[PDB]
Every structure is written in C-alpha cells, then in structure tokens.
Write a protein that binds this DNA or RNA. Structure first.
Length: 424
DNA sequence: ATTTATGACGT
DNA sequence: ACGTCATA
C-alpha cells in the first residue's frame, strides 16, 4: 500500500549555457571556443552571465567580472548583451527561448521554468509510444546520448561507461528484471532524445536533460551529465544517489530552509532524512515542508508540470550600485521612463503575440544601505500600454518614500513588473 | 557593484 | 496587499 511516486514521467530540459549558444549561432567566430556573455563593459569589463563549457574549464563562472575572467582565460571571447535606453536588453534571448519552447510543445506538455529551462510532462506521450511499439526491444541506438544513473555496476573512456550502463539497463528491461515504471522512463528518454534532436536540427541549440518520475528528480538528473547529454534517474536509483547527495543540491533546499534542515537535524545528505518520522519533520519545518521532505527523501514529489509556455510576468529593472545610486528627482523620473518604455514595447508585442493584457503594474525599489533585494513594493492599475503614464504612475506610488527636487536616501534599484494577465 | 530577470509562499 | 524565499 506504500506509494512509490512512480505515476508520471517528467523531464527537465536545460539549454546548455544558453545566452552563449545564441551568440555563437549568430557569430560563427565564437563557436567551439572559450566564450562568455557579458553585460555592461565599462565597470571591470562587465559582468559575465553565461559561460561556454570550454571557458568553464578555465574556471570562468557567471557573476564574475570580465576583467577577472580574462585573468583565468586570456583567450576568452566575449559577446555583449544588447543595451537599449541605458540598460541591458534581453530580447534576443527571449526570442531564441521562444524558438525552442515551440519545438518542445510538439512533443509533450511544457512548463516554462526560466528563459533556459522547461519541465516536460511525458506521461501521455510515453503511453502512446508504448502502444505503437509493443513487445519490440528498445535498441541502445534509440538512446545515443542517454546515461542511466547508477550504472554500470559490477572502460577508462566515458563513452564506454555510458554504453555499458545503458546495456545493463536495457538487458534487464528485455529480461523482465526491471519494473513497468522503468520501461516508462526508458520510453520517456527515447522521446527526449527525439525532442533534443529536433531542437538542435531546427535551431542549432544543444541541451541537457534529466528524465525521472517528478520535477525534483528530473532537475537533479539533468545536472548529472552535461553538456549535450541526458540522464535517466529511476526510482530504484534513489537510495544510492541520495546517500551521498548534499541536501543543498535538491531543488528548493539550496537556501535557508536547506541550511536549517542541516543545522537542526545534524545531517548532510538527502538520504539521511529517511530516518525521521513525518511528524518529526513537520515539527521542525512546518506542516508543508515536513510532509514534502518526508516524501522527497524517498524520491517522491507531486508538484505538477504546469501547462504554461509563457511567462506569468513581464518586468524590467536596473540596479544603480555605489556612486550610481539615484539621488535626484529628475533622475529617478528619467529611469522610470526608460524602464516604462522597454516595458511598453514588450507588453505591446506580448498582446499581439499571445492574446492577453496585463492589468497590474508593480513598482519595486531598493534604497541605499538595505540588504534585502526589495526595500518596498507598491502596485497600481495598469490601464494603458503607455510609457509616460506608466512611468508617472510608478513615480506617484513611490514618491512618498523620499525623505526630501532632491532624492534621499538614494535609490539602488528600480523595478517595473507587469502582472495579472487577462485574455484579450 | 557579482544583473536581470523569474515563480512561489506566508501572513 | 506586501514581504520573503529560491533559482540562473
């Protein structure tokens, strides 16, 4: 009577260093070279936000200043994010992301998780594929970039090991040693190979993927073998996988709650959670978190793949660090106008493309000396896709935040978000 | 001065 | 409504 969280087949697809691949498709000179994408070149060469795998090998990471990355990797090539109205403009990447998600939707139900990753619900697609091929062995040739986590168990080249693990898996499927859920995952992986082939053929982009029974395991699986590969994590693989898996690697446990789990229970690995009762976990972390942890450490999670190919919000913001912090009224107004103009453009395009209208405008700011990402959030009605009205409306709602033709304390961040979409 | 985005939850 | 958390 003990449920095993084996009801669904779920994938998570992550475009490998996505902004970089976009620039590399556009500029063949960047292909197969150590390359990074930077925004804002003046200050320390700019901030790196995406890094090719060739560059990662030199120790280049995101959130590194380009000048610093050049010390680690002198031959590093850089592509700059487009800058419009004095701020980074991510339109090219948003549009490329749409290219990929449109291809994914042909194969299965997708949840847009971010600009560069999507969850995929393959349960239905797997059931249908299982009827078309019935009692036919699944050839290793259908899974040319698939790793089976945990295998092989029992040749000094990675590709050799991959194939040996796959053979062991498939030989035990064909034997009848594995379970029907295992067959379901395997077929799911075949479909993902097919989806990933179609993405590469049609866009030129490569991606890694994880296939498992829920989103957390799929996300975890995806990161196990990168770039351009996919990993199947079976329910059976979970005890060994979790036995040495730091708690912070599991999605949603990378922050404060994860650190609390570690500190309060005196443990380090995900698997160690199984020794606590559900009541115990709830007593420390709350009813929801405790229940979630109890199921998750056993490889079980029920968060559905939401059928949502489009972002629920459309926002833009700009930080104004250090000396650049906004300190006059005219300056604060000029930047609201810049933000509002980008937002109007993206909103109008959204309306035309997606048949919806935003109804709420959220204004957020951060004041100098406040550690919290947001110092304050206020909303007002968004009635007109008009940059001047939007910027003026936003000024109105945050104007009282100023102590006193001058602005103090200085603003270190402005954020306009369009939310609350309705069909149009 | 590691951005500029996102989605979710608690109250 | 508003603040906080988590992710890349």
């Amino acid at each position: 009577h003990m449920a095993t969280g084996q009801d669904r087949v779920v994938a998570l697809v992550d475009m490998d260093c996505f902004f970089v691949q976009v620039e590399q498709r556009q500029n063949p000179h960047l292909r197969n070279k150590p390359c990074a994408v930077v925004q804002y070149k003046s200050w320390k060469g700019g901030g790196i936000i995406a890094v090719s795998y060739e560059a990662r090998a030199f120790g280049v990471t995101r959130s590194m200043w380009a000048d610093d990355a050049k010390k680690l990797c002198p031959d590093l090539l850089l592509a700059q994010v487009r800058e419009s109205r004095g701020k980074a403009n991510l339109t090219k990447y948003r549009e490329a992301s749409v290219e990929v998600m449109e291809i994914m939707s042909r194969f299965a139900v997708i949840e847009r998780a971010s600009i560069d990753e999507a969850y995929v619900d393959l349960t239905s697609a797997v059931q249908e594929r299982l009827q078309k091929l019935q009692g036919q062995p699944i050839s290793a040739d259908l899974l040319p970039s698939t790793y089976i986590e945990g295998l092989p168990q029992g040749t000094v080249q990675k590709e050799g090991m991959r194939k040996q693990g796959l053979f062991q898996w498939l030989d035990s499927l064909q034997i009848d040693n594995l379970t029907s859920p295992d067959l379901q995952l395997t077929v799911g992986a075949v479909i993902v190979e097919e989806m990933r082939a179609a993405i590469e053929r049609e866009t030129g982009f490569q991606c890694s993927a994880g296939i498992s029974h829920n989103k957390v395991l799929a996300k975890l699986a995806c990161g196990l073998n990168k770039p351009n590969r996919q990993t199947l994590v079976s329910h059976g693989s979970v005890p060994q996988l979790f036995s040495q898996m730091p708690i912070r690697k599991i999605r949603s446990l990378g922050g404060k709650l994860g650190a609390s789990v570690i500190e309060i229970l005196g443990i380090e690995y995900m698997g160690e959670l199984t020794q606590f009762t559900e009541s115990q976990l709830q007593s420390h972390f709350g009813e929801k978190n405790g229940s979630w942890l109890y199921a998750m450490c056993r490889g079980i999670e029920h968060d559905p793949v939401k059928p949502r190919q489009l972002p629920k919000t459309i926002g833009c913001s700009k930080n104004f660090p250090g000396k650049t912090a906004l300190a006059t009224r005219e300056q604060v107004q000029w930047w609201l106008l810049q933000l509002a103009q980008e937002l109007e453009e993206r909103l109008t395009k959204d309306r035309n493309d997606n048949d919806r209208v935003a109804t709420q405008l959220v204004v957020s700011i951060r004041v100098q000396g406040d550690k919290r990402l947001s110092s304050l959030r206020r909303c007002c009605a968004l009635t007109r896709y008009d940059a001047h009205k939007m910027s003026h409306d936003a000024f109105t709602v945050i104007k009282n935040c100023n102590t006193s033709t001058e602005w103090s304390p200085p603003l270190t961040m402005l954020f306009l978000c369009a939310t609350k979409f309705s069909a149009s």
